[PDB]
Amino acid sequence: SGPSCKHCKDDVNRLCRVCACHLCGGRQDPDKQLMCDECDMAFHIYCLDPPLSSVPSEDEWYCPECRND
């Protein structure tokens, strides 16, 4: 098993798009950041002030675009 980012691992301290929020790219709470498996990207689901009451672990979460497909 290897780190999700092998290009900025040394610069993990710096912000990089490969391992950061897709839109803002900030890290307000990456632990609460969900990634879409079909698109493999992070979503503002956690960047928004209002947090989710519960986070699904067994059920993979898909971005609205996937469901709107």
Partner: peptide
Amino acid sequence: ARTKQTARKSTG
């Protein structure tokens, strides 16, 4: 859901 192996909160 999927998360990154590296996170700001890391423990030994």
